[PDB]
Design a protein around this nucleic acid. Sequence first.
RNA 1: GUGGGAGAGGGUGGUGGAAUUCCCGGAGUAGCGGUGAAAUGCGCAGAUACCGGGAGGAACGCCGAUGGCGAAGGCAGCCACCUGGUCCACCCGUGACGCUGAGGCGCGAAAGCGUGGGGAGCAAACCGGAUUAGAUACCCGGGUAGUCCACGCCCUAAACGAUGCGCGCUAGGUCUCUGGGUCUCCUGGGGGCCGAAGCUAACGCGUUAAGCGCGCCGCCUGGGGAGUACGGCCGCAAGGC
Lengths: 87, 116, 70, 101
Amino acid sequence: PITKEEKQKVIQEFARFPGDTGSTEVQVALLTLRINRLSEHLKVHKKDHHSHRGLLMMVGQRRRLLRYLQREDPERYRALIEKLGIR
Amino acid sequence: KRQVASGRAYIHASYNNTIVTITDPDGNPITWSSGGVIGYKGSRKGTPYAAQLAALDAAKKAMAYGMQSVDVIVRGTGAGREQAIRALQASGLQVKSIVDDTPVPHNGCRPKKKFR
Amino acid sequence: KAKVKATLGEFDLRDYRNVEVLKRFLSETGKILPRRRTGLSAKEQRILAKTIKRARILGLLPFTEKLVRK
Amino acid sequence: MRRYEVNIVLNPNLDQSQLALEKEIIQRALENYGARVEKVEELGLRRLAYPIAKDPQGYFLWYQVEMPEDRVNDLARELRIRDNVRRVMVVKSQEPFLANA
RNA sequence: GUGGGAGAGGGUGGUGGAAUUCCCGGAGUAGCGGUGAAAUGCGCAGAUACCGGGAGGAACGCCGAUGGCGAAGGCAGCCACCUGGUCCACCCGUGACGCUGAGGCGCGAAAGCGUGGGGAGCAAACCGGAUUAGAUACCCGGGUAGUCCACGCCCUAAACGAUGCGCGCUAGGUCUCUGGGUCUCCUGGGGGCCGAAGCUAACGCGUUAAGCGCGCCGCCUGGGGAGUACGGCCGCAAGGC
Ligand SMILES: [Mg+2]
Ligand SMILES: [Mg+2]
Ligand SMILES: [Mg+2]
Ligand SMILES: [Mg+2]
Ligand SMILES: [Mg+2]
Ligand SMILES: [Mg+2]
Ligand SMILES: [Mg+2]
Ligand SMILES: [Mg+2]
Ligand SMILES: [Mg+2]
Ligand SMILES: [Mg+2]
Ligand SMILES: [Mg+2]
Ligand SMILES: [Mg+2]
Ligand SMILES: [Mg+2]
Ligand SMILES: [Mg+2]
Ligand SMILES: [Mg+2]
Ligand SMILES: [Mg+2]
Ligand SMILES: [Mg+2]
Ligand SMILES: [Mg+2]
Ligand SMILES: [Mg+2]
Ligand SMILES: [Mg+2]
Ligand SMILES: [Mg+2]
Ligand SMILES: [Mg+2]
Ligand SMILES: [Mg+2]
Ligand SMILES: [Mg+2]
Ligand SMILES: [Mg+2]
Ligand SMILES: [Mg+2]
Ligand SMILES: [Mg+2]
Ligand SMILES: [Mg+2]
Ligand SMILES: [Mg+2]
Ligand SMILES: [Mg+2]
Ligand SMILES: [Mg+2]
Ligand SMILES: [Mg+2]
Ligand SMILES: [Mg+2]
Ligand SMILES: [Mg+2]
Ligand SMILES: [Mg+2]
Ligand SMILES: [Mg+2]
């Protein structure tokens, strides 16, 4: 799945500053990572519906955080979106 | 015409009948009896007295074959499931051991509407 | 009557290969003993059941047995 | 690469040529699938609780290994294809949960 | 975020034993089965019972609980892989990013439909035997669809806690599942049972509220007619809204 190596790689890649863990940028990055993992898991296993509900909820949370970012600072929002390739 | 001198005795008891099969130490049967082998015909076959008479008749046929030492296997439940073993004990056959090997599944098959 | 854990050492509940101690938790038949007679906690019993099944599939513990004296 | 425990029960009646052959085949299977062998315990002749493949006994082997995950099932299949191997149970390693501590 | 944890949560592949049925063989006679009694039925072409071997399908005994998981439907052999939800401790990061939610979209027991597989046991319809004033039923013997699998439909239910979601507040006691702790105990988070205040027409509810409040959604307005008619939409149909 997602081990501490990949997780820390992504976090240190998307941190606003050294030591930051829960920035909106980092949250959306980790969200999108798990999103892609699950959606690739749902390319196969079309009959796994409960995991699909989990994916729905993850999409919802990511969309809420992106809406908040766009409301607060649009430029950092554009940077995040272009960096992750969404929307 | 066998002179077996020792063997097993299986008691299959149900709520409709009780039957006894006397067999040899490697599984092949020698004699047998049941509530229908003796006079009884209908539900009378399921009474404990019919089970006693069936066990005694099978034991005497085993005497004719020359049986002395007997190991007992029991499968099923019904009236006279125990009376068969009591008569088999007091039949003149030295009972080696009594074993209940009633086959019970691990929930594989669906029973009839009667059994649910 | 004595419960199994009361008379036993500091043993591994996750070792499916130790038949000597896993045999203590089976009944006269191959049935797994209830918590009344094993003296185990819910978590302990839940682990013991799976280890017993593992040992069964490896032919170490009996799937079922025959009752005597009946 | 995760840590696994491979239990192998095979025919007991083998002599030394056959037994060494089957064991080296298991070794080649472990090599071919990237299984680093951490330790080995060979119990051998043991009295089974129920007959397996018409035989009341069996020969036992236990390998603690570290190997990639997505190859474990294919490795188990290749280990099962052998005729003399009657039982194959690969188990993910775990910590020794104790009781009556 | 970090670090731990429990679990029939879901998907995929593998795999184990018990039992039923069937087939091969051995040994073995005269019935078995079934019921309140019986009969149909099966048995001399050798049954039932016993032993050994083989085949196939379906379901997982003990563990098992008054237990656990899930949003609900619902989910129990074992193993591996893929994956969801959730809980606790640390007080680390963001800094109101929240709650609800008409429509939409997805899920949705069983039965039912379509195409193709599969088929042991069970079993609507059906074929017989009984019972009875009659038996179109209950009881017995057979037995097809179906039950099982793949894919696509169907969208119902006593889909029940007959109790929408979220948050705050308001005695405790007892049993329990799962974490943490300086571990007669305390502190979270789930499952029950009594019971303060209070509520209720009463039964009863009572920190798992049916109490005290706030937000938002759904629904109700006498019974029959009737979940019918017409209209629309959805559906291959059954039919559903
Ligand atoms: Mg009868
Ligand atoms: Mg093999
Ligand atoms: Mg599960
Ligand atoms: Mg599963
Ligand atoms: Mg035959
Ligand atoms: Mg005939
Ligand atoms: Mg006839
Ligand atoms: Mg067939
Ligand atoms: Mg139970
Ligand atoms: Mg729950
Ligand atoms: Mg998980
Ligand atoms: Mg802080
Ligand atoms: Mg700040
Ligand atoms: Mg919502
Ligand atoms: Mg809606
Ligand atoms: Mg449905
Ligand atoms: Mg269905
Ligand atoms: Mg169909
Ligand atoms: Mg039937
Ligand atoms: Mg019928
Ligand atoms: Mg008639
Ligand atoms: Mg309300
Ligand atoms: Mg503790
Ligand atoms: Mg509580
Ligand atoms: Mg309580
Ligand atoms: Mg009062
Ligand atoms: Mg109460
Ligand atoms: Mg409340
Ligand atoms: Mg009220
Ligand atoms: Mg209405
Ligand atoms: Mg009116
Ligand atoms: Mg209707
Ligand atoms: Mg009109
Ligand atoms: Mg219409
Ligand atoms: Mg139309
Ligand atoms: Mg209708």
